[PDB]
Design an enzyme around this catalytic site. Sequence first.
Site, mmCIF file in Angstrom:
data_model
loop_
_atom_site.group_PDB
_atom_site.id
_atom_site.type_symbol
_atom_site.label_atom_id
_atom_site.label_comp_id
_atom_site.label_asym_id
_atom_site.label_seq_id
_atom_site.Cartn_x
_atom_site.Cartn_y
_atom_site.Cartn_z
ATOM 1 N N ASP A 92 19.529 59.231 -3.849
ATOM 2 C CA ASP A 92 18.336 58.451 -4.134
ATOM 3 C C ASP A 92 17.658 58.992 -5.392
ATOM 4 O O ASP A 92 18.067 60.002 -5.971
ATOM 5 C CB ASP A 92 17.401 58.428 -2.921
ATOM 6 C CG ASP A 92 16.918 59.810 -2.508
ATOM 7 O OD1 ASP A 92 17.025 60.766 -3.293
ATOM 8 O OD2 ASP A 92 16.412 59.938 -1.376
ATOM 9 N N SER A 93 16.623 58.282 -5.844
ATOM 10 C CA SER A 93 16.024 58.597 -7.132
ATOM 11 C C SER A 93 15.064 59.776 -7.057
ATOM 12 O O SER A 93 14.735 60.356 -8.097
ATOM 13 C CB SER A 93 15.276 57.377 -7.667
ATOM 14 O OG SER A 93 14.049 57.231 -6.965
ATOM 15 N N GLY A 95 11.973 59.459 -6.157
ATOM 16 C CA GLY A 95 10.607 59.002 -6.355
ATOM 17 C C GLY A 95 9.877 58.734 -5.053
ATOM 18 O O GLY A 95 8.679 59.009 -4.942
ATOM 19 N N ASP A 258 21.605 53.130 5.273
ATOM 20 C CA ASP A 258 21.357 54.548 5.524
ATOM 21 C C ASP A 258 20.092 54.678 6.359
ATOM 22 O O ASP A 258 19.202 53.831 6.283
ATOM 23 C CB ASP A 258 21.167 55.341 4.225
ATOM 24 C CG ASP A 258 19.767 55.151 3.634
ATOM 25 O OD1 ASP A 258 18.837 55.933 3.965
ATOM 26 O OD2 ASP A 258 19.594 54.183 2.875
ATOM 27 N N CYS A 296 32.399 55.623 24.178
ATOM 28 C CA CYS A 296 32.441 56.323 22.900
ATOM 29 C C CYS A 296 33.650 57.245 22.799
ATOM 30 O O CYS A 296 33.949 58.012 23.721
ATOM 31 C CB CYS A 296 31.147 57.125 22.728
ATOM 32 S SG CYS A 296 31.054 58.092 21.212
ATOM 33 N N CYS A 298 33.961 59.701 20.602
ATOM 34 C CA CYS A 298 33.688 60.903 19.833
ATOM 35 C C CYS A 298 34.044 62.158 20.625
ATOM 36 O O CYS A 298 34.222 62.134 21.845
ATOM 37 C CB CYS A 298 32.229 60.947 19.381
ATOM 38 S SG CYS A 298 30.993 61.752 20.490
ATOM 39 N N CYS A 301 31.721 63.135 23.590
ATOM 40 C CA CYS A 301 31.891 62.384 24.828
ATOM 41 C C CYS A 301 33.226 62.660 25.493
ATOM 42 O O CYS A 301 33.382 62.372 26.687
ATOM 43 C CB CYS A 301 31.721 60.890 24.543
ATOM 44 S SG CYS A 301 30.012 60.466 24.077
ATOM 45 N N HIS A 327 27.504 62.938 18.147
ATOM 46 C CA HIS A 327 27.665 61.702 18.902
ATOM 47 C C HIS A 327 26.950 60.538 18.224
ATOM 48 O O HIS A 327 27.509 59.445 18.105
ATOM 49 C CB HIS A 327 27.145 61.836 20.332
ATOM 50 C CG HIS A 327 26.927 60.503 20.967
ATOM 51 N ND1 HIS A 327 27.965 59.744 21.462
ATOM 52 C CD2 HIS A 327 25.815 59.740 21.078
ATOM 53 C CE1 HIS A 327 27.493 58.588 21.894
ATOM 54 N NE2 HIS A 327 26.193 58.557 21.663
HETATM 55 ZN ZN LIG Z 1 30.060 60.084 21.805
#
Ligand SMILES: [Zn+2]
Lengths: 361, 361
Positions: A92-93, A95, A258, A296, A298, A301, A327
């Site tokens: 980002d800038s 600012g 984002d 999930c 991940c 999990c 997660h």
């Molecule tokens: Zn997860």
Amino acid sequence: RPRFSFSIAAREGKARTGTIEMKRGVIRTPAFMPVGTAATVKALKPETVRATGADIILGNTYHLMLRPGAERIAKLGGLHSFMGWDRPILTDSGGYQVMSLTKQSEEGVTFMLSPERSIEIQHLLGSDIVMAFDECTPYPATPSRAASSMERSMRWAKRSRDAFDSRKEQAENAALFGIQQGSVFENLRQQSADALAEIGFDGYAVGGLAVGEGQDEMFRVLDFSVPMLPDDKPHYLMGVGKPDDIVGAVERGIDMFDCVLPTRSGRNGQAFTWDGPINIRNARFSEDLKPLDSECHCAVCQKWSRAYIHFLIRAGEILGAMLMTEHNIAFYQQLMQKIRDSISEGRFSQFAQDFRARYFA
Amino acid sequence: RPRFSFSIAAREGKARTGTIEMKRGVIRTPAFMPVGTAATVKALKPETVRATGADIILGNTYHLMLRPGAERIAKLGGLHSFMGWDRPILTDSGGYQVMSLTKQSEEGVTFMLSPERSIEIQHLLGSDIVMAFDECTPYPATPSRAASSMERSMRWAKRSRDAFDSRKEQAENAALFGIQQGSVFENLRQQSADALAEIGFDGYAVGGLAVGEGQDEMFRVLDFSVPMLPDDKPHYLMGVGKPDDIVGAVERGIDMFDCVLPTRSGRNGQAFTWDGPINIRNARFSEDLKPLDSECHCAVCQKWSRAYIHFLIRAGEILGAMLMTEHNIAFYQQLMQKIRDSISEGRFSQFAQDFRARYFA
Ligand SMILES: [Zn+2]
Ligand SMILES: [Zn+2]
């Protein structure tokens, strides 16, 4: 790979899926960028960020330009080398956080961060996607103040363009995005879109909408604002957002996102699930042996229970922040993958309906 | 694997190297046990603890018996399953931190933690190596008070033995260590060693020496105290310690070690190196691109610079705690590996001299 190539592979309504190819890697869109507030995605090694599926991260500039300083990071070899992430970084800038975390003038903001200095700092960090320096207009804004702020931002957008182009190494290896402003007003959004397209950028952000206006109003502004941007360039909704915000923004033509919500709220105990967010500190999880989310994929999990993570977070343990964050970022990336696949298969509208029906049950 | 088998493969002077085989894994000795204060080795996933080379961790009992409670952890499947570490865990009795973190009597300590309850808590956690419940005599201690404290501890050692043996599943799958007390007094150390050997344990700890007496005095007490213990069982120096303390304790016949120094001081900014510890927060590291240690094989030293870790720790970033902790635990494990290999090769005395010459240069 080229410096910058955005290709759209499939479309459904206003939604698009495709890729951005850059020197340091390919970015699958629609994309979610985990936020690195100060040269780290909080509580994650970069290899863990990548393991969740992220293609690109957002590096905030504001803290780094103060400590260690942009020149020092450049001397140490650039932000990529410094933090150990070798894929694209959007910066980002600086600012916005200058205001939130001051004396404004046409030259820039003293707190001196000018458009030229912002582009130079992002160059010194070694940014792959450089944001033009502008002002995030406060909400609400009168039409007069929104217009004044937008007009200055467009003058700064031209100054950002020229500073970027003046630096051969940056112009040849990085990309530059311009930011549409104009608060909630259609005529100002149109003038801003026109001004940015006249200058020409590699991608176009929709700025000024992560500002407390509520989802209905954000969606209303996106409805008319995204079509004003060049169709063949990426559309980046800065600072958004909650899972349902992302789904509806993709329905309106946004390609990049984002926010700090999955990281920051993860450390605070909020875990995202396909059945809506949960607060893992709640006593109801003290003996819950299920994973954070039942589907999930991940690593968290696969290995640990709600009960253990409940215990860690209520104890203030660092591993609690690590596991919640991994997660949550993985959940966001799985959301983006489901979005991309459903657009590719022409069933995104059904996915959005199914997602909302279960997430808000 | 057997419930418990300690084998000595090589000896040099009083130093020994070998293995302890238990149901959940093999422990290479001399061994360093990273400390898990409350069901986590702070700032590390268990897979990262294992990647540093640890064979066994120490789980403190005191915090867990308060929250979540030993019965709740048992209901959730035991500490191993709860925290995700499937290798041996040694648990302390909980009595020490009851005093430091109260009403003492012959029955136990109210704050009621009796010998019987301590053994039961360690059973409920699913400990592999159970510590007898005793008192860590304060330093300094008069001979009368040291004797009174040691004598009570030996009565509690018999109560611990009997409680352990009364519980079939624990007696058949875990091991039990007794703790030698007696402060700095040779006659009390001898009486304690004799009392413990009469009862019979799987291993023998040297208790009461991590208490601010200084290395000279600790070494003096170890000189006469370790030979009093059964030679064919492991010797565990509780709560020790700094790298040079470990080397000298191995020279005196110690096989097992634990302390919070690499984890706790790692989060505070102290990194261990073969040239002595450094405080990474010091300004001299702000632009140092070298790894924490020039020879260390850990993942942190393969990937990140002193300069980056300096920045993270001075920013209070969680990744700073993670990286410092992984390196420090890896350094300790590499120290233990160099100790084991040098004993196996009959060059440990030379290794100790070379280690001290460089570490204290
Ligand atoms: Zn997860
Ligand atoms: Zn290292």
